[PDB]
Enzyme design. Sequence first.
Site, mmCIF file in Angstrom:
data_model
loop_
_atom_site.group_PDB
_atom_site.id
_atom_site.type_symbol
_atom_site.label_atom_id
_atom_site.label_comp_id
_atom_site.label_asym_id
_atom_site.label_seq_id
_atom_site.Cartn_x
_atom_site.Cartn_y
_atom_site.Cartn_z
ATOM 1 C CG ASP A 160 -1.937 1.131 1.192
ATOM 2 O OD1 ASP A 160 -1.986 1.877 0.191
ATOM 3 O OD2 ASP A 160 -2.687 1.276 2.179
ATOM 4 C CB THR A 183 -3.516 6.330 -2.605
ATOM 5 O OG1 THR A 183 -4.658 6.320 -1.739
ATOM 6 C CG2 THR A 183 -2.459 7.261 -2.028
ATOM 7 C CB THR A 184 -0.530 4.378 -6.499
ATOM 8 O OG1 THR A 184 -1.545 3.521 -7.039
ATOM 9 C CG2 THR A 184 -0.069 3.825 -5.158
ATOM 10 C CG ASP A 236 -10.915 2.369 2.363
ATOM 11 O OD1 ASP A 236 -10.925 3.582 2.661
ATOM 12 O OD2 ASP A 236 -9.905 1.645 2.496
#
Lengths: 493, 240, 71, 242
Positions: free
Chosen positions: A43, A76-77, A361
């Site tokens: 993560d 996120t990435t 989430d």
Amino acid sequence: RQAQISNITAAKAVADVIRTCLGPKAMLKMLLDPMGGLVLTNDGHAILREIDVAHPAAKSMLELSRTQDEEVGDGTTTVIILAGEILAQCAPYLIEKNIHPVIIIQALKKALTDALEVIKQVSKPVDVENDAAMKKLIQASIGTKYVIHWSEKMCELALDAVKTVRKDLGQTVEGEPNFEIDIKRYVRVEKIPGGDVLDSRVLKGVLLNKDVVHPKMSRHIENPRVVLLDCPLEYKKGRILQIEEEQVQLMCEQILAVRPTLVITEKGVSDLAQHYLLKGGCSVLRRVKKSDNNRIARVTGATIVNRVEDLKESDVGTNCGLFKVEMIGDEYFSFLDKACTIMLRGGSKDILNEIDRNLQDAMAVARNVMLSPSLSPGGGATEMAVSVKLAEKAKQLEGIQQWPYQAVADAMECIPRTLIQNAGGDPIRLLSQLRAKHAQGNFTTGIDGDKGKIVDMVSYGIWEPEVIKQQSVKTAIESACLLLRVDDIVSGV
Amino acid sequence: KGIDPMSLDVFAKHNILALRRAKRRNMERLQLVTGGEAQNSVEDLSPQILGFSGLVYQETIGEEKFTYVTENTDPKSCTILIKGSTHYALAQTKDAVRDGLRAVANVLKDKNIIPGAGAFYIALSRYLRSANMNKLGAKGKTKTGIEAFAEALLVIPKTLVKNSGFDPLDVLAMVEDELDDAQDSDETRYVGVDLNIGDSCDPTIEGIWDSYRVLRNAITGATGIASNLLLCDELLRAGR
Amino acid sequence: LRELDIVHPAVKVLVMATEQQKIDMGDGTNLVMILAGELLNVSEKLISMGLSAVEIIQGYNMARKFTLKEL
Amino acid sequence: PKAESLRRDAALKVNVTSAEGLQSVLETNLGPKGTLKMLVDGAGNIKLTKDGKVLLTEMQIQSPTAVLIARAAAAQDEITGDGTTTVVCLVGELLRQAHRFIQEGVHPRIITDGFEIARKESMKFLDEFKISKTNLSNDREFLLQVARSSLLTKVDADLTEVLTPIVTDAVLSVYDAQADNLDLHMVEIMQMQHLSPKDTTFIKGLVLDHGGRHPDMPTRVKNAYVLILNVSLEYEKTEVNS
């Protein structure tokens, strides 16, 4: 020009580590700690958080990831790679080609508007009222997790949680609220140990863990009367026991004038006031937080009052269904049932902690659907479909603004490129056929993560909400213009 | 508790063994082994509280003296006394006892057993190699991972004969030639590597068996750990 | 050996075996040291020949039972 | 023009090389024909064992690659309890066979995806290859050969015949009738010095450390009465000061 190179070097070196962290097939990362430990998780949030950096450009990406996680739960990435590739593609223009940075910043402002228009064209409508359609959406954050078995029950807890906060209204007078929902304060989960996940229900109201001052009380009240107050009931300050017992009785008699069935005290309650209100047929709750009184006033309607003698006659116990002293999990609870309360159950504390981050989430995906009934194809379909439309609009773009504009088209292809490199296929052969596919076929053809060959999304949809694509492109332009705006580096106080 | 020496002479005429300075943990163990309850007060002592024991003999050693509570009807507790002259003799045997008792306990709990001496590794490596060509239901590039996994299990029978000095290639051809003849003969014959002689052996006759739970998580556990080493993209080092 | 500090692990084996000779008897302190020391010297020809040390240990176990039975 | 060239593969080759040196050392103790490793902490302590987990806990691992291998063997002893070294040998050797494919351009995901497919196919063959053993107590003769698998590995095999009846009779004694469970904590393990390893015998009940000292104590008693008393039989003092 030395500081402009450091802004590109510091931004790429940090973003290059998480390039392999995107996708379900993403490769693992190893971060060696100075104390001898390592991090096996892939993560991108837990990796870069423990990495100490020097140049301030890396610290700007850390605060950007924390802000982006508050909006969307996943991807996120994706924001870091997209915001880092735009600066990388502008490296030969800003440095070698000697293009002025404001010209690039001015071009990114116009490219941001055209990027949002292409996403709205390739987007597809979706029904937010269909309960079966919302299950396949949240499922993106369900599968490959421990909640895959309870997904049927998890979707019921996620959908029913936002139904109380949401308000559906529209007109040309007060405008469109765009379905504003606050997950933080209202939808905040409460983890109760014991019980079963199948028995978890969505409770509409507020919950308090403080017990009742008396062991034996009525388990249910026909017409509960809620009275809120600030100043506690105790002997005030300027033979002695006769005055102390009388002074507390006079303060409690003023509340009993309306004969309430429930008493709520913000501060502590002395033992003298507990005996006078015991025979009156009303429960007393000591030590009530001040921040809770704002939410309790909404589920009850009692007006906030400071002094015990200032209680207004408008205070009523209406809009309160029942009051239950029933104990669940060896802990006394209170049921007072725009704001609900999520009650989580499990078999241990580790189960509740896993459901916590999974349910947050899960609701983030369902929340993004409420902002607008639109969906975008995942797996690099939306990323490549925009890059194809960017090259076609260049026919009217002649002039100096065209040169920095081409850096955006090549940056959109970086997201599907990282998925192919992790898939193992030829990145040159697949991206060349994928870009030519949109020029002929439909824009909805993406890339499969498990296989790695060009396929249609009709088989496996993988439909992400538009908010993920919006915030990814919006924050990328702001992050690209953030580092290009600072051309110098000065240290010291 | 302690016993004064004045009472030892009286206890000796009746041939009564006296003990003192006992561990508190061993006192509760005697309640389960013998069955007699602990007597807190002599005034409350009853003849039904006392238990029964078998032959009790005291070994004569100048350094220490042992008392045997052993030979009981339903003790339901065993003891293993490890003997050795040096320090490493006691530590080496202790590890064999801890691993020896658990391997036998797994046979009683788990009714499934597997033969050792490379019987499962050789049979699985040969089966997965010939089955991949008949199935062809995965992918063409998957053949590289299946062939590498089959050759990775052959290191165990080659390592057992490597320490013994025998040729690992010579002992491998004798095993593969036996599996081909036993396959066309339409029967079930288990083949294993004999370390003493160097030829093959029957693991059922030789008596080499392993637990089922041991080898079940061994192949699955080593697969995920070895795969994660290849999943590492970059090795980062901070603070150094 | 008691006044000297023993460190090397191969030396500790002969020292701990020497204390085994101190108990149960008062003779053989120099016998256990010379005999066990020569068994490693004659084993050098087997190591350079290529014979593994595993079968060397097994060979002494078969000769030990034949020696103790003949005594 | 910045750089983009290679993923460079180098951090992966270092991880494989680190696993090659770890297996090469630990492969020497595999099987009954293996070798016995020795550990010295510098203070004179010597622990001789072929178990994988017991050795790794006494040594420190600097390279982060072998850290995951040692942590993997810790979970194996808590579940399987046997073959901790065999699991380590399968992790490192698998990287050597995959090293040839890495240099040819094969992506590591397909290498790992092919292992999960073969792992699922191995479970189907595992159900047919396994043999169900009866819970009947007549298997004591068969359990003698099964117990030798763990015994012959950790010793030179000269002491196996001595420890064979001890380990076998210890498990089946505490085993409850009618297919019930057992308790390994009920079997006590003790040690003492100044004796030969061939004198090790099985103890049915519980043994006590400190014995009574007196010349007239009985040498052997065929049957005796057991009494547990908390009252002190020695000289005591008055409850009140006098």
